[PDB]
Amino acid sequence: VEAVYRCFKCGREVKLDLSITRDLRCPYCGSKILYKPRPKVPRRVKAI
Template sequence: MVDYKCFDCGRTVEAEHVRRRVRCPYCSSKILLKQRPSVRKKIPAR
């Protein structure tokens, strides 16, 4: 499952909460960002 991060309060929001209601359960912000891994893929140039 993908977790989200609230843009306003910075807390992690589980995907279960986002499906039911598209707001942060802590501060009611409507802006949630998908958390991405900090791994970078190196793609060779052609």
């Protein structure tokens, strides 16, 4: 399952599978920490 994961340090658009990946790293700065970016769907929040 290919998915997009922003990097923790440099905030780069890293895309890679996770189920099959054995070593997890950002291919730019070598960071081992990544985020899962927010989706591009509209969220509705009450302004109460």
